[PDB]
Design a protein around this ligand. Structure first.
Ligand SMILES: [Cl-]
Ligand SMILES: [Cl-]
Ligand SMILES: [Cl-]
Ligand SMILES: [Cl-]
Ligand SMILES: [Cl-]
Ligand SMILES: [Cl-]
Lengths: 450, 450
């Protein structure tokens, strides 16, 4: 009868009248509007700082050593301002911000929106606007989760189930308004933050509301159907689907290796400054100045990565250039993200999977000419395979790539590529990167409390 | 210290090796291949019986009262075969089968694959091949979930984690191998089966493997890219997005009203036979013969519904014809599903949401000519709005409709329509239908135990 009283517990759940608090559902539309407006202002300010930087690199065009100095120095001072705001005011605004938000969903990290929200905005503005190899995905999730706490504090909402609802609403609205991906922002919460999020009928409807309001706030100011404008690539036949499983196996081995390089470079770059702010800022200007220098000479090795993925998905880079771009963008991704700059690793990971997927597709075309393959259809499957192998959230990584590229005929090749990425990353001993960063944040704050 | 002790449990959970045995993942490839093969033997056995029934109406087309007798009696004898196998050999194979698989993941229902799997197959060929208003999701999910228990019992695998993994693998594979929707099969388990499924890192990977192997087995025998071949419809502009909220608000009221009509007709049709097998079989041949009669005279009011959706989305019907189809298909959906026939309600719900959404999309083009609306974008948004209001799985129902229609420019209108459907079905006191059918089975089982 151990299942009999369990069955009587099941019938006691059906006759419950599930109430509908419309107060938290209205604030989720206030959150999602404010997240989507702060996401648009972040993207328009990062792009304005990037167009002002290349506008300074064309007025000094005939003078080449002066151009390389003002490519370094305009990106160094822009990065030094971002490192200074994090180190002086909000140290939890360094890095991505997803481990700070999913640590807040466990009631383990504080949400200091009076400090993080001006520092993650303006410090990430000069960091990403300076041309560093960092994405706006992580900043927008942390700006979103801090806006949802701000709305909870301004309107004085009490209760701990409303606190986790509005914090997850803005993190869902942050992903939905960074990438024009309303489907991935919902799957950000129920698939990637699955151990963190408390699934209530109200809390998942509020995640839907904030995602809707932040996608509408995005599309008012951006009228393109694809964030990454690759074309309409070919279908994948059934006799070519095993090549996407092999491509996932290669990504699923590299994924844990890349995660050990992220945490290993976090430790190695911390020995340079030792926690000192005036050496953390000057190391951040040397890293930020290099990526603005690399933004002029060999610009495929620097930047967030979205200006490389449509070039690499088409057959424009050779096999020797994709090897150079991959090694250089592995070095500058670890140099930017693991140094504690405000900026995520998600959009640099898309450029690393596109280049590694195009390299796989170019070998697959020359090895199998009987399949009529494309190099670009493996770049899409490789894009969400490094998020499956390192971030270890394949479903919100697949959906995000299909929404950014508008290529939904590759759903089954991406699930095949994302399975072998997740299967071999668990097998080879890999953890999620945002979990591994948060577990090192939690073990550090357990050590200063001794 | 209350959170410091919880911080210690979040650190030691992070240092664990994650224990990947490949034996249950290979068995998911065996399950997914067998589910995907049994789904195309079900889809091509139902379609063969519907071709022999239409072919019997062309041979003797000169005699019209014999033609209405042959159309009645070919479907009456076929449905009587389906109602008899349920009432004699496997009474839990009646209805959809998703409440029986959902109760099996809760360890409340037995999985008798030696009885259900021949009865759900050959009784499903009788009811669906007779032209009754019943879908093939529920049959294939229950055939799928019983294959996952059959593979567990043949290979004699031990464990309660392995039993719930392979049972949810085939239920996911049953939705992937029907409708060519691998993405909706995964979301069937982590979103619709959220209180039932025990999420593990390996139990979601085995759900991926069975979904992959069943979508491949479907696509070996089926080469259409979309099942519901509506065209490439228009995209919805931002000034028209509030009409999809009103379409969701209307569906979110009707959803609970349609749910109590399903449960009310289950009690009403049970008053006819009282559980007697002879009166249940004769009532089911009367209902099944009525839908084979209606398959010849006014064929839009019977059948599974996949023939009606491309005609309705194209704007081929009138307004009074669209009102007559909605009323008459509601009566035949309540007659077929609530009488205990092997066959689901999901694909009859897509035909009801398309017809009700087209009628909304025709009022919207009459009232707002300045919006430049197409009536078919509300047919697709309304298609998954009855799944969000009655089945109350909005993310599963959006992705399924998108994967069946290949219209992914309507992601955000379907999320707005599915939000207003879910929010108004919870506000007006509606439950999920499969959770309400199972709970009426579980409360009936407690009543047998006095
Ligand atoms: Cl970080
Ligand atoms: Cl990022
Ligand atoms: Cl990130
Ligand atoms: Cl049922
Ligand atoms: Cl169905
Ligand atoms: Cl069903």
């Amino acid at each position: 009868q151990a299942a009999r009283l369990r069955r009587r517990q099941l019938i006691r759940q059906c006759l419950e009248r599930d109430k509908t608090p419309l107060a938290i559902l209205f604030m989720a539309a206030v959150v999602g509007t404010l997240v989507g407006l702060a996401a648009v202002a972040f993207d328009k300010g990062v792009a304005w700082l990037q167009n002002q930087r290349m506008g300074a690199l064309v007025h000094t065009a005939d003078n080449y050593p002066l151009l390389l100095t003002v490519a370094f120095l305009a990106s160094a001072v822009l990065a030094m301002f971002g490192y200074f705001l994090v180190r002086k005011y909000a140290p939890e605004a360094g890095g991505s911000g997803i481990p700070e938000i999913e640590g807040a969903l466990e009631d383990q990290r504080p949400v200091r929106w009076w400090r993080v929200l001006p520092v993650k905005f303006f410090g990430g503005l000069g960091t990403l606007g300076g041309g560093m190899v960092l994405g706006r995905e992580g900043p927008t999730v942390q700006i979103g989760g801090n806006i949802g706490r701000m709305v909870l504090d301004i309107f004085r909402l009490k209760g701990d189930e409303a606190r986790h609802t509005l914090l997850a609403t803005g993190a869902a609205a942050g992903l939905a308004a960074a990438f024009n991906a309303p489907l991935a922002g919902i799957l950000f919460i129920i698939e990637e933050m699955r151990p963190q999020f408390r699934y209530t009928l109200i809390s998942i409807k509020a995640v839907f509301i904030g995602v809707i309001m932040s996608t509408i706030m995005y599309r008012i100011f951006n009228h393109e159907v694809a964030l990454i404008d690759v074309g309409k690539l070919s279908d994948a036949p059934l006799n070519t689907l095993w090549l996407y499983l092999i491509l996932g196996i290669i990504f699923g081995i590299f994924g844990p290796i890349f995660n050990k390089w992220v945490l290993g470079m976090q430790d190695l770059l911390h020995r340079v400054h030792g926690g000192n702010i005036t050496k953390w800022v000057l190391m951040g200007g040397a890293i930020g100045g290099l990526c603005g220098l690399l933004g002029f000479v060999a610009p495929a090795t620097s930047g967030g990565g979205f200006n490389l993925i449509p070039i690499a998905t088409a057959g424009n880079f050779s096999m020797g250039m994709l090897v150079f771009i991959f090694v250089a963008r592995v070095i500058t991704t670890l140099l930017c993200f693991s140094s504690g700059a405000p900026g995520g690793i998600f959009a640099p990971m898309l450029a690393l999977g596109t280049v590694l997927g195009t390299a796989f597709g170019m070998v697959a075309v020359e090895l199998f000419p009987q399949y009529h393959l494309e190099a670009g259809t493996f770049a899409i499957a490789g894009m969400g395979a490094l998020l499956a192998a390192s971030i270890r959230a394949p479903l919100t990584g697949i959906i995000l790539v299909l929404e950014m590229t508008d290529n939904y005929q590759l759903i089954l090749p991406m699930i095949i590529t994302g399975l072998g990425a997740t299967l071999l990353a668990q097998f080879t001993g890999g953890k999620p990167l945002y979990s591994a960063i948060l577990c090192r944040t939690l073990a550090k704050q357990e050590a200063e409390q001794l």
